[PDB]
Each structure stands twice: as structure tokens, then as C-alpha cells.
Symmetry: D2
Subunit: 385 residues, 4 copies
């Protein structure tokens, strides 16, 4: 099966190292990006499906690196149905679970936290809600977990540790040994960073992070309560861990992180999540909002903001997507400046603070959205011929 | 019925003329604020309910000036139950309907748009969801409405015109005459400002706004697509209309509006809404987020950010609330810096970009929240004795 | 637009005077039943859509004469989303509102009850949820309504009065004049019959019904509390009003009503509703269950039970549907005995107490269901070729 | 902690061996029934909570032995929120999971079905929705499960096998060995008995049941499609397994089973469930309706129908509740004839076919309902003094 997207005004690659591709044509074959170039690719198109981008912008499908899933497409935290479908219409094609703290009666012992992670991992792989690639089993560390539990979880398809600090495992002395077992058996590890619900140890320090050694510093701008700029500095300077900016966090610290990362050349490490469902709410346009806020308020190139939502995120998680390059999964968005925006194109809209209009979303090359029900309308909508 | 709130660390009034009150005790009598002062008000307490603010902050209950209600506490736009109850836990005690475009099969003729406005106006006055004061009937202007229709609507308790532009009445030549009739019969009038679903008339200009003469320029920072800075300049400089900053809008333009309003002495005109339910999502902490955003990013005193969410808004709508002053309705929040925040108090938290922890919320003096289920935890929680 | 259903094993007409049609082919043209006959009707089919009934049974689409709607497809009484599309998968193609007592903060004055009925009438005609024909505006009688109000409502498309007794109008002395105005202006009238919430007047008598003169005696078997058999006798014998058996009512009295009506030649007056959403629940297979219950427990022929759910109901309401006859609206079900049933066909299943499997549902000739998501599976499924 | 219920007009025990207790006073101590008797028990009450039954009826809290839970209080099958809370208002204080077929993306391998059962078992014991005792982890048998899997599940608190036939284990030849392992390690076993979704083997026979050896013959009257009377007779006569009559099943077969069980002395084996959520709907008054239907249509004493909903069910599952006897868990309903009913008391109402009014529900002696939101109003309401 073959699909060609033609007449592309701008291709944003999602790769921070070279964020724009000098090409106007993308060929998709058997769910993968096959070729990127010019009109020469249209000869020998055969019976391909043709999508006319009508001069608009193609980006990778967005990742939300911080979703609190609990099974299927219902969110108990805010009593919301169909929230994953809604996020897809905001461009989100892959979701990473940050753990399931809202699972009703969440099992908090070692066997229970394990069984829940296994359940959610298998269930989301069995059924992609609205076609979204949900990596749904992110184990919450609890006292009593052994190395064999991590071996068992890996056997059953679990490969993510959810926010360290959500369970009974909180201080680095207890966390580090488990994080070590996790890493030894192929897990990616997240860590809650910011204000906590405990009057004793109310915040999370750089030393905590440094000693625990997560792959991802979760909500570095707070969830929603932020760590100090002093601790931000130490995390940025003393580690190479991913620095996750979340929509449901502190915008001042988000700006600080973005600006300092630009100063220090650390933008490749910045990844976007929602941290929702949460007390804040549920925001299907959350990742686009992150991109618009960072680009429009923190003086980051909109193409680089796209990388923060896409390739930066898949780089940390080791996924074969989030980047427009041959061999990568064909998860793609066709978007434009929205009607009435001062901006001439999608990247211009992002830089101006306007959420772009999404026309088409592909997952594995298949059209799963042909007009977003959530974004404002694209000025130039893609047409599937 | 009498309630006394004692041991208050800071009183934020909601009145931009004097944002802080140098007092530590508040007396509530028969649903109204009766006295503001020192410990002398504790004399002859009697059977009064005593609330210990534990050295934290008292503000007015927040207004959301831009809610798209549709009956009760269910939002079809994002398939969300109990969203008003949720907003209450983010401090929202009064909501203004911006109209009901999501009402299923929304009647779009003159008789139908009127009937729906009357229905929702009466229904929300009959049943306050979770105790929230919802002004739920905001008529959407459609072709065929007469002055008599406005007289009838006023008789039946309707006094708000929802975002002009949501219905078939769009251009100023059609809108102006109806807004005249509305204003003649005691209505407050809202107007959609920014990008629209119309390709031909893609944006709403300042000329449109100046000609139509609404009381409120709805989502001046876009819903979510913003007008140009040049059009913002003109609305700010050529009118005295309220300028509504919404959570589901352009953050760059929100910053521009706030900073320019500060330079031009127009901060009293700025009011906060969510513009939700919408494509963006549903954000019960949305008004708090507006406050933190404007305070931490636009260099606005957090006390004045409170005014934008409270007294500025009730001033525009002529409501006897949103201000801590004798004779005003006793809608009050007790809040603090959240656990782990670098800030020492609630106002400090807001200026730092951290959502404050809400402990207690009163509506008409009655405790409707005793611990927020949505905000981070307050460092010092108020206790009802 | 033309559709032909061929290879029909049994046609059940919905007309109690002739419950079975000796034919095996139905032609639908422009949303209406055009012809019923044999294979000759297949000649020169041309571009026609062909549906192979696979030797199974065709019946009219079912009516639910007692639905408590409140706008769109959400039911606040039991916090249920998409209940109307669910009922469609139980074969329900038309719904009659019995009033909207669950509308949150339901307006209870004359002007409010009017405004709500107009709103719901218009909204449901604007948007058929899942394609279902919902007659959604059934005014609840309240003190203060005048004849001019009924004139206004009729002008705006309202033609139903909901259960008399749901509002402040309760006793026959107050009700009779209003019902008189209703009937004068072309309204159909329902009346609550059974146990009430008032300790003083705890029940409804035949005298009440005789004096009030509704078209439909709502929930004659109770909603859920039944009137006595003595009162049932008088309603059956002293009036010609429709006798509505509801799913959410008393099964002993349902049986009594069915058996006595058979004895007295009054089966044409028996009509089926759910009386849901209600305290009992929400039962999308409710009308089918009524048919199965009456056929299997009350010794009523299954074909006559079909009439009670279809033609008996549309006759009372004067709707051009519910009967398989030329010129009637092409609302049709193709159904069969369910897998594993002792019965050999759909009617046999109903008589045996087994809910039939629904394969196809047409509304105005368009396929809105091609396999029921709610019924057990049909042994022989219809196929659209 | 002590509670006394006084002024009771009738006590229905839930014990089929002695269905009525000739007493008017019940003492509850530390969550258990302490004593049953007369006025003498009111002596030296002290600080005991006193509940005045107002001359109405006390029964045990009802069981629903066939609930398809899937985590928390949301039901995906019918998109219903808060269904367990709703069932509590229908008197349901204990639920038995029949398995979780509706879990989104339900894991179907051995490891996954195990993980899911462990998760649900633990989660429902951690958090009782609305106070309801949910036995939530009922494993669905899948090919690949071993005796060791059952040892592991038992260790983690799982003790129920959900309907045999929901998963890849369908043939009695495959099921019997697994059911043996379950019984060896303390499990109670359910078995789907009725029409299936496999055309090849479309039903379940008595021989299937005899070979499999479940504890409960699930939905003996169909789910919703019934087995034949021929198979019913043999199950009744050749096994001593529990015969579950479900609300979402065939009423003719329900009547056949109840009547034949009365003739054969087998009423102690009859237990009640809903089989919901299901295609039929969600019926919070479903257990009450079961009692009303069997008492009013099948000539079963209403006190015996209560046993079928209570003590019969807890006997099968080995639970220390369902019966008013000293030492049993204090799960109790106070109920009456509903307003307007021909019946003078609660049992009379059930026999008459009228759902009784529930005033108070206790779980572990704690008042979880003080007025049912779902049943009609009790004539005489209990009052906590
Ligand atoms: Cl969190
Ligand atoms: Cl809008
Ligand atoms: Cl009712
Ligand atoms: Cl089932
Ligand atoms: Fe966190
Ligand atoms: Fe707008
Ligand atoms: Fe009724
Ligand atoms: Fe079953
Ligand atoms: Zn989180
Ligand atoms: Zn709006
Ligand atoms: Zn009713
Ligand atoms: Zn079942």
C-alpha cells in the first residue's frame, strides 16, 4: 500500500538537528516513510493514494509524554469520555503513560502495582483507542518489588516505569536500586519532580534526581507546583536526562527552562507532555498549546517547538516514529495557519501564539483524521484525492 | 446565620482601587459580608461558625466570564460530567454564560434561540450546580429577533446576550440594532473577537467592535485565534469596553494585552474567562491559571490578577459580589502557597506561576468546599471549628 | 432512491387488523414503502440497493411511547451517554417524549415549562440522535398556562402534552380545562396513572382519567407503582383511551391488562413504552422485552405484540409510520431467532421469551444499523448486497 | 460503635430455612448484627445511634450475583457513570463479578487474564464504590492457564472464576480441568448457560454443566437467550448447583424455573443477578424487579424471593452476610410499601408486583442511604434519630 503527500509548503522533520526538509513531496509505503523529495517522486506513483497538501505544512504526529491513562478512553479524574480520540484531533498520535494514579482503588502492593501495569500495557496494545499508539503500562514503584518482578513485567511487554514518587517508593535511597533493575531490563524511567503532597519532604531536589537517575525528569515546570530555578539549573547542568515541560504546570518555569536550554544548547532534551487527566483538567489541544506557548513566549523557533513535541520525545523513548525520515513510521499531520490568524503558515501561527488548524492526521500511513473536530479550521485544508 | 473567619494572613479585596485590606478578620451575616477588621470583631460571637484561616489568604470567589453551558453539569463538547462542580474546586463561584452553541440541535430561529435562552436562564437560577452561581441564559442573536423579544426575555429573567457572531447575526450592520435593543432593556452584551469559521470574513476587527458596541470584547486574545496587535491597540485606545482574556486563547496576545493595559492604565477593564467547554478542552483550574500566567509572565501584581478574576468582572456585569466589602455577597476563598512552592504565601505563589492551594470556598457564607479536590494542597489549610 | 428487501421469511405488518402480510419482497422508494409482494418486484431493479433478508423476519421499526428526554442523547437521571443510539440498536426508530422531569432545574412556571417544551421540540427536530425520530417536546402542565400558550406552542411545532401530574397541575379539576385547550389546538395528551409522591392523594383513579380525558393513559401498569385492578377495569371499560404498558412498571398488572384486553377485544388500544430514563434504569432492549414478556407470559400472539410496539402506537399519535403498507415511512427492522434459541424464527423467539437478534434497521429507507450491538446475534443476518 | 433499629413492623431474615423473624428490634455492634428481639434491647442504649423503622420492614442488603464490572464505577458497555452507586439505591450492598468482558482491550492470554483479575480483585477491595462490597476479580478462563496460575491468584486475593465461556475456554473438555484446579484452591466458579455467539455450538447443555461442575449455573433463564426446559429439568434434577435467575434474561424460563424449583423443593438453590451491564441495559432496580416478578408471577412467597436475593446467594459464595442473624455483617435495608400501592407492607408490595420504597440502607452498620434516589417513595420512611 502506497500514499503520496504532494504540494507541501513546508516539511518540519521533528529532528532538532535539521528541523526543516527542503522537499515538497512525501511517499509512504506499507506504513513507513519511504521517500522525501520533489515532483520526481510522482512519476512511478502507480495506484497510490494521493493527498494534496494544498501548500500547507506537514509535521510528525505529536507525542504526549505524560498521560495518566487508566484503561480505554474514559478518564475518572475529570469524568471525561473519549479523551484519547479528542487528543488525536489535537494531533497526538502516540501517548506515553506516566502511570495510573487515578485507577479506582489502585493496587499499591508489589504484586498489585505489577498486575495493573501488565493489564494496561497489554490492553492498550490490544486496542488503540481511535488508532492512537498508547504505551499504557507504566509501573508505579512500590515497596516489595524485586528484580524478578521487572523481568516478569518485561516478558509481558511492560517497558516503562511511571513517575517515581507516585507510590510508596519516594526517596532516592529506595528508588535507585529499583531504577537500576529497570534499566538493566530495558525500561525507560520517569520521575516526579516538583511539589509533593507530603508536609515533610515537600519538594524534589536535583540531588534526588541525580541519585535516582531517571531517563525523564517529569514535569520539570511542576505538576503543577514547580521546583526552584536553582534546582532546574542543577538538573540541566549536572545531568543529561530529558526535561519534560507539561501543559498543566508553571508557565514561568516553563519559560525559564526553555530560555536557559536555548542558552546552554540543551533544547534537544526538552520534551512535551500534558500531565493530564489531572486536577487542572483535560486538554486535547495541550501539546499544540505547549508548542505555541514556548515558541511565542520563550523565543524558540516554532520548528524547534515541533521537535520538542515529536523527535525529542521519541529519541528518549527509543520509538521508531516522531521524525520525518525514510524508515520511520508514517505518523503525520497536515496543518496550516488557522482562519483569521495574522500568520501566513502553520509555523508562523505557532510563533504568533495561534493554535494551527489540523486538516489530516495519518497513523501508520492511514488517515485517521480528515478534518480536526478540535483545532480552529486550517486556511488550506489537505484533500485526499 | 453568622460566620467569622479569623487569623487571616492577607486579605485580597478584588477591588483594583484598593487590592489589599489591612485586616485579619471577616464577619459574614445572612449570606453577606458584614465586617472586615481586627480581633475586636470576635467579641460577642455567640453561636457563630468560626473558621480559622490559619494565617493564609482570603480572596473573593472567582468568576469565569466565558462558560459555554448547555443545561445542568454536563458538557457535550468534550463529553464531560460534573465540570461546574470541578470548576468550583478551582475557586469558581460565579459563571457567566457566553452562550450555548453546543446545545444539541440548537434552535437557530428567533423563537427558538429565545426559548432556549429563557429555559437555561430559569433552569440555572432554579438549580445551582454544586452551589455555583450560574448566569446561564445568554441569548445567541439570530435573524428575526425583535425589540419585543428582548422585552419578553427580560421579563423572564434573561439579561445577557452571548457572543455576538455565534449565530446568523454576524456583521455590525445587523448586530448593532439588536445590541441597541438589548442595552435599552438592561442586557449585558458579549462579542466574539478573533478568527472565525468563515473563510470570507475570517477575522473580527476593531471597526466591527466599535460599531457594534458590546459591553465585553470576548476572548480578546482569541478563541483560540487572536486578532492582530494593531486591532488590540484600537480596541484598547478607542473604546472603554471590557477586554476579556481567556484561558483557551493566544498566550502571546494575552501577555501583550496585559502589558499594554498596564502601560495605558487600563487594567481595570481586563476580565478573565475560560472559553470552555471548547475544542481546547475543559480546565477547572483555568481562572487560577489565567491569574498565574498574567502575574508570572506579564509582570502584573498578583493582587491585581485577582481583581481581573473577581471585581473587574462583577463590575462589568453589575453583580453584588466579587469584592470583599460590607454588603457584598459572601463568596470567598481561603487559599495558600501550595506544598513545595518557593513562595511563602498565596499571592507569592501566583506571582511565581504556581497554582495556589485552595482549602475553603464559601458561597453566600456557606462552606461548599472544605478541601479542593483539584488544586495542589495548601501549606496551611483553613479549619472550620 | 430505491431499496428492495428480498427473500423475506415473514412480514409482520404492525397493523392489528392484519398482523401478517403474505409476501416476501418490499420495495422502498424515496423514504416510503412503495410496494409489497413477490419476486416480480425485483424485475428491472436497476440501480436499486438490494437487501437479502436471508429468510428472516421484517417488522416495522419500534416506538417507545414513554421516553424522558432532556436534550440530545445524554440521560442525567442515570448518568448515561448515547442512550438513544443504544435504543436504536434495540429496534427503536421513533420516540415519544413523556415530558422532561429530569431537565436540570426544570422551569416550572407557565413561561418556563412552555420555553422548555419549545426548545426540546425544535432541538430534536433539528438533530435526530443516531437518526432516531424523536418527538421531544412534551409540555408539562403547570399552573398559569393559558389557551394562548397552547396556540404559541403549536405555532412553534409542539404537539404533545407530557404526563399530566408531573407538574403543579395534578387534580382533574385543574387539568381538564388545559387538556381541553390542548385538544382544540391539535395536541396529543398523556396522563400519569398510578402511585404518586403525594401522601394526601397517593394514587390516580379512573374518575381522574375519565374527567381529564387524555389520549394516553400512561404506564397503566405503574411507573413503577400500579393502580388497582378495579381501576384498570374502569379505564378499559369506560374509556377508549390508549393503555400504555411500560417496561419500568408492574409485571403482574401488565399481565392482567394484556389478558383482560384480549378478553374484551381491546388489544388495539395497548401501546408500549419504557418509562426510562427513570429510577429503574435505562433499558435499550426495553420495547423488545415488553413484546417478549407479553407474548410469553400473557399468551398474546407475538405478531400482536409487534402491533403493540408499532402500529397501535402510531395510530394513537397519528404518525405516518409503524405499519408496513404503501405510502408509510420506510422504518423497518430485519430480525431473526437468536443463536441458540429453541425458536425457529423471530416471532417464535418472542413467544418463547427470547429477545430476537436484530440484523438491519432502516429509517426513511436508509440503513442506520447493519448489526445490532445490543441484541443477541440473529441466526440469519440480513445482508446489504 | 452501636446502632439500634427499633419499631420494626416485619423482619425478613434472608434465610430460606426460616424466612421471617418474630421480633421488632435489631442491635448492631461493631458492624455486625449483635441481637434480634424486643423492647428489652433498648435498655441501657447509651450513645447508640437509634434508627426508627416507623413500623416498616427490615431485610438483608441485596446481592447482585452477576455484575460485569470493569474497574471503578463506570460501565463502558452502556456508557454509564456511577452505576454501582445507583444499584445501592436499589438496595444492592454486595456485588459478585461475573467477569470483565467489557474491559477495553481485555487481555486474553493466560498472563493477561490473570493480571486483570488480580487488578480488579485488589482494586475493589481497596475502594468500595459508594460503600458497596464488590467482589470484583472474577477470572475469565483462557487457554494457557495452569494450576500454578490459580495458586498465584488465590495468594493475591482472587477467589472467583467468572462465566466459563466468556474466553477461549468454552468446551467442557477444556474447562473441566481448570475448574478442578480452581476448586482445589478455594475458588467459586460461574458458568455461562444459554445461547452463545458460536453458530456451531449455539447453546449449553445439561451434560456440559455436569461435566464442567460449576458452583453457579449462570443465567439459567438465558443471557438473554435461554436453554430449553429439557436442559433446565436435568440441571435441576441431576446437579445441586446454584440456579441463577437474571433480570436481563427470559421471563418465561424464569417463571418455569421458579415454579419447578418450588415443586421439586429446590428454591434454596435459586439466586438473583442482573447480568448487566449488558446489551439489555443497566437496571439498578434489577434485583428488586427479580423479586417482584418471581413473587407476583410465579406464586413464590415474597419472603422467599428475598432469600433468593440475599441468603441463598451468600450461602453459595460463603459470605458472612445476606442473613439477619447474630454475628452476620450488618448489611440491612429498611423498606416499605410505596405510596399509592394496594399493598399494606413491603412484602405485600413485592407480591403485588410493586417495587418497594427503600428508606435506609446500612452496610457494616453504617447508613449509606437515608432515602433511595431510585425506588418510589416508601409510605413510612425510617428515621435516624
Ligand atoms: Cl500527578
Ligand atoms: Cl466558541
Ligand atoms: Cl416519572
Ligand atoms: Cl455476557
Ligand atoms: Fe507529578
Ligand atoms: Fe468566540
Ligand atoms: Fe408517571
Ligand atoms: Fe452469559
Ligand atoms: Zn503526572
Ligand atoms: Zn466562546
Ligand atoms: Zn414517566
Ligand atoms: Zn454475563
Amino acid at each position: 500500500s502506497k500514499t503520496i503527500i504532494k504540494n507541501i509548503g513546508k516539511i518540519v522533520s521533528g529532528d532538532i538537528k535539521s528541523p526543516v526538509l527542503q522537499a515538497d513531496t512525501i511517499v509512504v509505503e506499507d506504513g513507513l516513510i519511504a521517500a522525501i523529495g520533489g515532483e520526481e517522486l510522482m512519476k512511478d506513483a502507480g495506484d497510490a493514494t494521493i493527498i494534496d497538501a494544498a501548500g500547507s505544512t506537514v509535521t510528525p504526529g505529536l507525542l504526549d509524554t505524560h498521560v495518566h491513562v487508566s484503561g480505554g478512553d474514559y478518564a475518572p479524574r475529570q469524568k471525561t469520555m473519549d479523551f484519547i480520540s479528542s487528543a488525536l484531533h489535537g494531533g497526538v498520535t502516540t501517548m506515553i503513560s506516566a502511570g495510573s494514579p487515578h485507577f479506582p482503588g489502585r493496587p499499591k502492593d508489589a504484586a498489585g502495582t505489577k498486575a495493573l501495569a501488565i493489564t494496561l500495557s497489554k490492553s492498550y496494545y490490544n486496542a488503540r483507542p481511535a488508532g492512537v499508539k498508547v504505551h499504557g503500562g507504566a509501573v508505579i514503584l512500590e515497596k516489595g518489588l524485586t528484580e524478578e518482578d521487572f523481568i516478569e513485567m518485561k516478558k509481558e511487554g511492560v517497558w516503562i516505569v511511571g513517575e517515581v514518587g507516585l507510590g510508596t517508593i519516594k526517596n532516592p535511597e529506595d528508588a535507585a536500586p529499583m531504577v537500576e533493575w529497570a534499566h538493566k531490563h530495558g525500561f525507560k524511567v520517569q520521575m516526579h519532580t516538583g511539589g509533593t503532597s507530603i508536609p515533610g519532604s515537600s519538594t524534589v531536589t536535583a540531588d534526588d534526581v541525580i541519585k535516582t537517575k531517571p531517563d525523564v525528569v517529569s514535569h520539570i515546570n511542576g505538576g503543577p507546583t514547580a521546583i526552584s530555578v536553582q534546582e532546574v539549573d542543577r538538573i540541566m547542568d549536572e545531568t543529561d536526562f530529558a526535561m519534560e515541560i507539561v501543559q498543566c504546570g508553571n508557565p514561568k518555569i516553563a519559560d525559564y527552562v526553555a530560555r536557559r536550554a536555548a542558552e546552554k544548547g540543551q533544547l534537544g532534551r526538552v520534551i512535551f507532555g500534558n500531565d493530564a487527566p489531572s486536577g487542572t483538567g483535560l486538554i486535547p489541544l495541550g501539546i499544540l498549546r505547549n508548542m505555541c506557548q514556548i515558541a511565542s513566549m520563550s523565543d524558540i523557533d516554532p520548528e524547534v517547538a515541533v521537535c520538542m513535541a515529536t523527535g525529542n520525545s521519541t529519541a528518549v523513548y527509543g520509538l521508531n516514529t516522531g521524525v520525518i525520515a525514510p524508515g520511520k513510521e508514517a505518523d503525520l499531520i497536515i496543518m496550516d495557519t488557522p482562519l483569521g490568524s495574522v500568520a501566513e503558515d502553520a509555523m508562523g501561527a505557532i510563533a504568533a501564539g495561534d493554535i494551527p488548524g489540523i486538516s489530516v492526521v495519518l497513523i501508520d500511513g492511514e488517515a485517521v483524521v480528515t478534518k480536526s473536530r478540535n483545532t480552529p479550521p486550517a486556511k488550506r485544508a489537505a484533500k485526499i484525492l
